[PDB]
């Protein structure tokens, strides 16, 4: 019987089942069921590991360790959090990227959705790792903290109130374990305005020209393609969980804490490593900072300099060139974050810098226009 | 959103097809793929391959300064 | 002129059971949805696992 | 002073994708932690019944934590004694206020317990390679004090006296206890010390690869099955 | 002389009755034989583990 009448499965129904969908739709718009099924795993594992971690400054380490030895099935439970939180920024980025590409992100709001929903991911990430009291998320949770510090006039007063102290301490252990809990129900709810907006229009495809002379439902399709798809974010998932736990995880997490002793060459998670390089590039307190923010600040000026009379990239032999440019000086950023701030890697380290910013706010939209002339558009 | 019925205004075009329980779920897989695949890639390389092999290089280049510049080095100081 | 139409040919799409007119395809019905089929329990099965 | 060495290449048998561990050589390296090692580092989170299932016996991992004394709870008085030795929390703790384990052995602070994973990249082979390659001092610098030299280490010099070799043994089965193979085995316990999980986790992963390599096919094709409609679906456009 | 993948649809597959009674059916005994053959296979490839290493102490 009907799907369509009933007050709560026409909201499924319409969701996921009679939704018309563009026929031709890539592997690339994978993803955002794939973010979807990431936050559920965070959630689960998240809330099982809360039935066994404690948030006091003494017991903290501890008691993941409790986990990992003690409960049972800790470890695989604990694992697939971590590597799970992995795999959710591997799937932002190409999200993230499908959406430049294809220039998905013509759908204004439901674009600028996505950024707070970027926004909130990291802010959660940042507050998670922090968790186990390591060395490194305690200088870790020290230098991103202190950013805020940067911020002229109340900048002090505002990490001291974050601190809740004089420096990263008991009291801030304690509320990002809070904090933490809490985002992800929060990311939930903006994650279905996002996919309120998008509905609003449907999905975009490879070729940016509209597909409603060829939808399809995504009730057989688009149902089997996402299951597919799951089963391999699984699959890779389980890889790093079940024979490479510790690959992504820095070995000094193993060792408590020391407010007092800075680890010689701290490293931030992978997924920060370009926007860590970004920061450093420039040697000016309030410039780093302010360089990181417009780092990941530059998404919503993206739409802004669309000027192509296409819309995807699919029939854009410049803008493709220069994308990958794009993407091969954000490998760049990464390799460079994680090096020592040293003589070939901080010039090499700023000049991808002025890279990446030159590409987007001036490279792509004069390809975009010399493409217009070259089409006698 | 939108519903099948609502879309758009089309005229003229027919549609033939098959029931899967009467077709082949991989065809010639091997026969016809192999040879798209090929072609996407030639289609492609030029695009995506060179910014690549451009970090390559300096990621080579960089770390082989970095060796020689501080740690091998200490190159004389002779007296 | 409707009748000019004709469907066009899937011989290199369609199961050899098929394939050939003169023979009713009933025949195969069972096997070629037996395999199918198959397939499905066989992945739920060990999804269950 | 910032220059350094890595560590040569792991053939430990239990490198490998699927590779247990050699519970013999696991017992071996307690025995090296229990005689040795243990006098100097705390090994906080293990305990006597995590043995059970590895290396020992029900009944001998009673009987080896019953070599030692504890500090059980107090009774009627507000009292603390000692007692024979549980089987539910390891702990010989050689030092109270971690400060003591620095004026004992002058600065240097022994660190740490179940090792590898655990602040030393290259894990097992680092601590191989410190502890069976102390070597001379070469010339043009000295030490700040009898320090002890070694050539891995971070800044080459530092800490600890020189502990292997001092032939100690017990190993039953009949085995000489060398240099090496005392550090082979210390490593390798080590190894189950920071993860025991290690041998269920490869089993697991094992049936991981063996389902996925059922399913994947599988669901594929189911996808392509249903997909079959549109893949060989064709146009006609037939205008007046 | 039908097939038998005729035979196992008319007979189980026709049916979601019988299609579902017999994947649970399938399941059951699919992960028993997956384990004992899976394990079988884990322990060959190792045989340093608390197995063989036991037989020599029935003792205490
Ligand atoms: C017994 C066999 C034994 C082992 C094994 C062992 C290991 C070990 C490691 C892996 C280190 C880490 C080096 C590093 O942190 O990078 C380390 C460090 C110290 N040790 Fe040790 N140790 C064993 C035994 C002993 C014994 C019996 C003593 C006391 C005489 C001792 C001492 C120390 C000290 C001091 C250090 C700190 C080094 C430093 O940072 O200065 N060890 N040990
Ligand atoms: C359901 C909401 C969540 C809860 C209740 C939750 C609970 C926890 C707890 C208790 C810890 C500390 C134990 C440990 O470190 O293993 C932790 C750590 C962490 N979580 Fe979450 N979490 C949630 C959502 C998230 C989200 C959205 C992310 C981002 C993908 C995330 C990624 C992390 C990370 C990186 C850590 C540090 C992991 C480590 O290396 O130990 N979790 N979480
Ligand atoms: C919690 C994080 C996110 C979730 C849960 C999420 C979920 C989804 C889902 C389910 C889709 C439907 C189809 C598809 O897979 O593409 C989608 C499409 C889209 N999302 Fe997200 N996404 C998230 C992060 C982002 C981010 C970071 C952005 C951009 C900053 C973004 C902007 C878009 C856009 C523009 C589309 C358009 C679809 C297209 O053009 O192909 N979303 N998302
Ligand atoms: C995991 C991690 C982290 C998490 C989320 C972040 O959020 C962003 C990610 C990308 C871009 C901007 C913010 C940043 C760092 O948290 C943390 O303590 N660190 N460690 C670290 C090390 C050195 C400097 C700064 C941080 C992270 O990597």
Redesign the pocket.
């Given at each position: 019987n009907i799907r369509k009448s009933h007050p709560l499965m026409k909201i499924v129904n319409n969701a996921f089942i009679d939704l018309p969908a563009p026929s031709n739709i890539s592997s690339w718009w994978n993803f955002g069921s794939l973010l979807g099924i990431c936050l559920i795993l965070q959630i689960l594992t998240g809330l099982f590991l809360a039935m066994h971690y404690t948030s006091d400054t003494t017991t903290a380490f501890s008691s993941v360790t409790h986990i990992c030895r003690d409960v049972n099935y800790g470890w695989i439970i604990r694992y697939m959090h971590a590597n799970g939180?992995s795999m959710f920024?591997i799937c932002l980025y190409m999200h993230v990227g499908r959406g430049l590409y294809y220039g998905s992100y013509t759908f204004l709001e439901t674009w600028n959705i996505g950024v707070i929903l970027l926004?909130t991911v990291?802010?959660?990430?940042?507050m998670?790792?922090?968790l186990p009291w390591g060395q490194?998320?305690?200088?870790?949770?020290?230098?991103?903290t202190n950013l805020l510090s940067a911020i002229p006039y109340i900048g002090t007063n505002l990490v001291e109130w974050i601190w809740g102290g004089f420096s990263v301490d008991k009291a801030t252990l304690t509320r990002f374990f809070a904090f933490h809990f809490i985002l992800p129900f929060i990311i939930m709810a903006i994650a279905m305005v996002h996919l309120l907006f998008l509905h609003e229009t449907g999905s975009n495809n490879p070729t940016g020209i509209s597909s409603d002379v060829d939808k399809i439902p995504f009730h057989p399709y688009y149902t089997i393609k996402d299951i597919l798809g799951a089963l391999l974010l699984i699959l890779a998932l389980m890889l790093l969980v079940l024979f490479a736990p510790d690959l992504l995880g820095?070995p000094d997490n193993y060792t408590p804490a020391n407010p007092l002793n800075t680890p010689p060459h701290?490293?931030?998670?992978?997924?920060?490593?370009?926007?860590?390089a970004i920061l450093r590039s420039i040697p000016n307190k309030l410039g780093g900072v302010l360089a990181?923010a417009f780092?990941?600040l530059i998404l919503a000026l993206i739409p802004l300099l669309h000027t192509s009379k296409q819309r995807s990239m699919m029939f854009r032999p410049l803008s493709q060139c220069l994308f990958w440019a794009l993407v091969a000086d954000l490998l760049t950023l990464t390799w460079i974050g994680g090096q020592p701030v040293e003589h070939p890697y901080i010039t090499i380290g700023q000049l991808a810098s002025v890279l990446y910013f030159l590409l987007i706010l001036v490279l792509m939209p004069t390809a975009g226009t010399i493409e217009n002339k070259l089409l006698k558009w | 959103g939108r519903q099948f019925g609502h879309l758009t205004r089309v005229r003229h075009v027919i549609t033939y097809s098959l029931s899967p329980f009467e077709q082949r779920a991989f065809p010639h897989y091997f026969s016809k793929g192999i040879p798209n695949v090929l072609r996407r890639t030639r289609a492609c390389i030029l695009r995506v391959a060179p910014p690549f092999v451009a970090f390559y290089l300096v990621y080579t280049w960089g770390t082989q300064e970095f060796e020689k510049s501080k740690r091998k080095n200490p190159a004389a100081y002779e007296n | 002129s409707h009748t000019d139409i004709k469907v066009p040919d899937f011989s290199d799409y369609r199961r050899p059971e098929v394939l050939d007119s003169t023979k009713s395809s009933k025949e195969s019905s069972e096997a070629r949805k037996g395999f199918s089929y198959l397939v499905t329990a066989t992945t739920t099965v060990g999804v269950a696992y | 002073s910032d220059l350094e060495l890595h560590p040569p290449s792991y053939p430990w048998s239990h490198r490998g994708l699927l590779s247990s561990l050699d519970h013999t050589s696991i017992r071996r390296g307690f025995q090296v932690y229990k005689q040795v090692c243990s006098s100097c580092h705390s090994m906080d989170y293990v305990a006597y019944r995590h043995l059970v299932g590895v290396c020992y016996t029900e009944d001998e991992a009673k009987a080896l934590a019953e070599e030692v004394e504890v500090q059980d709870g107090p009774n009627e008085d507000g009292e603390m004694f000692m007692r024979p030795g549980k089987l539910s929390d390891y702990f010989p703790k050689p030092y109270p206020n971690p400060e003591a384990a620095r004026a004992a052995n002058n600065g240097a602070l022994p660190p740490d317990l179940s090792y590898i994973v655990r602040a030393r990249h290259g894990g097992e082979d680092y601590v191989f390679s410190l502890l069976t390659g102390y070597c001379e001092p070469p010339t043009g610098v000295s030490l700040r004090e009898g320090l002890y030299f070694n050539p891995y280490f971070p800044g080459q010099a530092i800490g600890m006296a020189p502990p292997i070799y001092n032939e100690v043994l017990e190993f039953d089965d009949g085995t000489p206890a060398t240099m090496s193979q005392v550090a082979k085995d210390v490593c390798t316990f080590l190894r189950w010390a920071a993860e025991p999980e290690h041998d269920h986790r490869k089993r697991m992963g094992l049936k991981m690869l063996l389902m996925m390599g059922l399913l994947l096919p599988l669901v594929y094709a189911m996808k392509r099955h249903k997909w079959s409609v549109l893949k060989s679906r064709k146009l006609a456009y037939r205008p007046p | 002389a039908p097939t038998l993948t005729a035979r196992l649809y008319s007979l189980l597959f026709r049916r979601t009755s019988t299609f579902a009674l017999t994947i649970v059916v399938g399941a059951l005994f699919f992960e028993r034989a997956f384990d004992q053959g899976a394990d079988a296979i884990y322990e060959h490839i190792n045989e340093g583990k608390l197995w063989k290493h036991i037989k020599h102490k029935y003792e205490n």
């Open positions: 939180a920024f926004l990291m802010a959660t990430a940042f998670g790792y922090v490194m998320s305690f200088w870790g949770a020290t230098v991103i820095d701290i490293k931030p998670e992978w997924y920060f490593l370009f926007a860590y990181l780092s990941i | - | - | - | -």
